RNA sequence: CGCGACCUCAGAUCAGACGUGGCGACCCGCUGAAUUUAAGCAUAUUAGUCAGCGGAGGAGAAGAAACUAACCAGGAUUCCCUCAGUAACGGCGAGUGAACAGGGAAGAGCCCAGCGCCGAAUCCCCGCCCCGCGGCGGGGCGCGGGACAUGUGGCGUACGGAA
């Protein structure tokens, strides 16, 4: 029942949430386990770069940013090709490949 | 080659040929039982297609289902509730018949498993498939690395599952705008996830 | 009832020989909390509804 | 050139093999777990058994439930290397079999019964 | 009459004991177990009774073959070998 | 007066079966005089047969296996119980030599194309 | 005589061959070689045989 | 009036292996309501939920676009934040309700049919010798069998490939 101007309201409890409450009491926990497997894996590959392969400048879609430059997947076949270097060696090499990047520009 | 003619000549179902064929081939198989084993494949284009190979090992089986969509298994009326659920003739199942079959073949063949299946030909009431299936503990299927895969207990009873071919359809899971369901594992998933209250330790 | 079969007459042995009471010496153990069997079976009551 | 002389086709005996087994199943068959001194426990050496003995010369003898008349006829002949004239056996309600072996006029069961200890 | 008069003829039994799970269950006419389904396959097993459920699972039992294959796997499943002699 | 294995194990197998049976006497006079009520040190000793008949039958069944496994050692086929039993899943593997298997694809690509061993800003 | 039914099938498969319209390209095989000409070809084929284990 | 091949089809306590059932906290495939809310109630809501059935693992499923976007473009799947209680659905009432992009955890790619080239160059089983055999392999010797030309193996698959 409303009363002297509340604001209209309408959770979403209507469902059994209580047996699907999903707890996080366990985050430090997986954040000690991924700091240990980060930690096994760069021990484990010793003279590699522990962040890994090399990932290419890419740009933003959806004009919102249109300015911001990231990581990308992998390079492109075209951009090895022009740096005269063979994609499947690559990969053995430590470069990120990718086979459906585009280039337009 | 001959396999892309065979399969022209199997596209090109509504010709006299092919419709003799089909004919001639669900009189046959109506006439015979429910489930058998057949020796060759009927379409040896669509069986190396779909991955059956002529080894040592390989199984297929010739599976009639009765056609018809599926009523609701209650008696006469007595469909109690609202009615919204009072629907019981006009009812259709999920999966197709032709992973009805694959299921089929699978429950009766517990030692083998079960790879995919085909079309071979459809009566008013029944439906026909082959339904290919590999045995796990076969040396030549063992040894071979391509074909090995299936040898895992990953893969017991795909088509239980509904990991193979006909039941993956079911599932209605694909990439894309088009479904935007079973984003996650599957469809469950998806909704396990969409509906789980994430409670953080610092809210 | 004179006419059993063997399976109810040997559950019926063994219902038997279960009834008989604690021995004397099991009470001076140690660690002993038990003082009476508490699973007797009178055959008056508590009928065995085999 | 075979005339069918019946309307019925009867299915054919074709030729079956017997087993020819590459290995046994077991390495080796299982020792028998029923022998002389397991087939008969103990004697019984109550009033009602001891004149059972010294009237009737006969024997009181507790058997396996597994056990048979043959059995404990020849597990007796056996251990004790006397004959027996027949057996009778009953089920206590306890779980042991009771044997009442009555023995040959020639041997005398009050000396057997001194042989074997009981009296 | 359909009270203590009718509490007196109760003479003839339909429940035997059942030679699967061990209770008196199985029905004599029907040949059938109600507690575990003898003549069936498969185990009988409702999600609805929880307690039922629990009564009889994989622990409740002497677990003969359990423990022995929980001890070898924490020992590691070797087999074929002993520990060096004296 | 005690029956050890250290003992059992070199004896022959008639001597074994002869030890046995004599055990086996014993065991049942043992139990005559158990009955006949006899005396405490005649009852303590029932155990003490029954363990030395255990200790026997052991010596002989693991001297019996032990030449039955080593006949059997290296003929393709074995009866199932001188096979190991490890678990039921666990016997159901791969041979250990098709899972290193590989493919000729995989075996030339894996040769024309390994992994190299790299480092940066140097 | 009551025969199997795998016999009663292959029988009337080939009366209903015998008995349906067949088209032609099925009928075609109908025209087989006659027997002088099959044995000359296969006299003439006996030297060309592919060789063997 | 028979014999000898082949295709379909049975018998075997034939030789060697495989599946059955249980647990089921997590997962996958089906079937699947009503209490409740709407101050009644029939669409809706509870709800692809409870119950029922089947199937595995230590995880399962999914997974390398018949994708998202309309931007100077991004680029497998899975999980967290955010998008967002938003677009949208609903006796447009109660109520229901995503996805894109962005930031992170992780990150690995691949293989067939077909098309085609190579003397079927392929695979399975049985005998002998050597190594070793408690997750039965490797090599050699067998005019010893079988499967396969109604297609096995090598190259090769969309990022092009082959000569
Ligand atoms: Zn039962």
Request: a positive charge; one cysteine or more.
């Amino acid at each position: 029942a409303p009363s002297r101007n509340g604001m209209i309201l309408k959770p979403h409890f209507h469902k059994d949430w209580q047996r699907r409450v999903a707890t996080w009491f366990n985050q430090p926990a997986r954040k000690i386990r991924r700091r240990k497997a980060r930690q096994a894996r760069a021990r484990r590959i010793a003279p590699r770069p522990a962040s890994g392969p090399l990932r290419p400048i890419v740009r933003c879609p959806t004009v919102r940013y249109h300015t911001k430059v990231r990581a990308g997947r992998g390079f492109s076949l075209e951009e090895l090709r022009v740096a005269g270097i063979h994609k499947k060696v690559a990969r053995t090499i430590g470069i990120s490949v990718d086979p459906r990047r585009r280039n337009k520009s | 080659g001959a396999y892309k003619y065979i399969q022209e000549l199997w596209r090109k179902k509504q010709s006299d040929v092919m419709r003799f064929l089909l004919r001639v081939r669900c009189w046959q198989y109506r006439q015979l039982s429910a489930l058998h084993r057949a020796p060759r494949p009927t379409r040896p284009d669509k069986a190396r297609r779909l991955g059956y190979k002529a080894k040592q090992g390989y199984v297929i089986y010739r599976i009639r289902v009765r056609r018809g969509g599926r009523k609701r298994p209650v008696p006469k009326g007595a469909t109690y509730g609202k009615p919204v659920h009072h629907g019981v003739n006009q009812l259709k199942f999920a999966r197709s018949l032709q992973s009805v079959a694959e299921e089929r073949a699978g429950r009766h063949c517990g030692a083998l498993r079960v790879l995919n299946s085909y079309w071979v030909g459809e009566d008013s009431t029944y439906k026909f498939f082959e339904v290919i299936l590999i045995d796990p503990f076969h040396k030549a299927i063992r040894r071979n690395p391509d074909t090995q895969w299936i040898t895992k207990p990953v893969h017991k009873h795909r088509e239980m599952r509904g990991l193979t071919s006909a039941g993956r359809k079911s599932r209605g899971l694909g990439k894309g705008h088009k479904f935007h369901h079973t984003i996650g594992g599957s469809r469950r998933a998806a909704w396990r996830r969409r509906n789980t209250l994430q409670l953080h330790r610092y809210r | 009832s004179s006419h059993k079969t063997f399976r109810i007459k040997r559950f019926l042995a063994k219902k038997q020989k279960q009834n008989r009471p604690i021995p004397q010496w099991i009470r001076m153990k140690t660690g002993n909390k038990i003082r009476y069997n508490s699973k007797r079976r009178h055959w008056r009551r508590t009928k065995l509804g085999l | 050139k075979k005339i069918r002389t019946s309307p019925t086709f009867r299915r054919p005996k074709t030729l079956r093999l017997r087993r020819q087994p590459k290995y046994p199943r077991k390495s080796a068959p299982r020792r028998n777990k029923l022998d002389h001194y397991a087939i008969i426990k103990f004697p019984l050496t109550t009033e009602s058994a001891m004149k059972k003995i010294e009237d009737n010369n006969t024997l009181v003898f507790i058997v396996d439930v597994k056990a048979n008349k043959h059995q404990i006829k020849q597990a007796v002949k056996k251990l004790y290397d006397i004959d027996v004239a027949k057996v009778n056996t009953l089920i206590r309600p306890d779980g042991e079999k009771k044997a009442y072996v009555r023995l040959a006029p020639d041997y005398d069961a009050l000396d057997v019964a001194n042989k074997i200890g009981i009296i | 009459t359909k009270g203590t008069s009718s509490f007196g003829k109760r003479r003839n039994k339909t429940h035997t004991l059942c030679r699967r799970c061990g209770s008196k269950a199985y029905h004599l006419q029907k040949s059938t177990c109600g507690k575990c389904g003898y003549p069936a396959k498969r185990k009988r097993k409702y999600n609805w009774s929880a307690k039922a459920k629990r009564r009889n699972t994989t622990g409740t039992g002497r677990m003969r073959h359990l423990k022995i294959v929980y001890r070898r796997f924490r020992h590691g499943f070797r087999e074929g070998t002993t520990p060096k002699p004296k | 007066a005690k029956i050890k294995a250290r003992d059992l194990r070199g004896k022959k197998k008639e001597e074994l079966l002869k030890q046995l049976d004599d055990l086996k006497v014993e065991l049942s006079q043992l139990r005559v005089a158990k009955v006949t009520g006899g005396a405490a040190s005649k009852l303590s000793k029932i155990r003490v047969v029954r363990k030395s008949i255990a200790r026997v039958l052991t010596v002989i069944n693991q001297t019996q296996k032990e030449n039955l496994r080593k006949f059997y050692k290296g003929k393709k086929y074995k009866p199932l119980d001188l096979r190991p039993k490890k678990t039921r899943a666990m016997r159901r593997r791969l041979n250990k030599h098709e899972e290193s298997l590989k493919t000729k694809k995989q075996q030339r690509k894996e040769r024309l194309y390994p992994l190299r061993k790299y480092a940066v800003k140097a | 005589v009551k025969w199997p039914r795998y016999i009663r099938l292959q029988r009337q498969r080939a009366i209903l061959y015998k008995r349906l319209k067949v088209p032609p390209a099925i009928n075609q095989f109908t025209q087989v070689l006659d027997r002088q000409t099959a044995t000359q070809l296969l006299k003439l084929a006996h030297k060309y045989r592919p060789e063997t284990k």
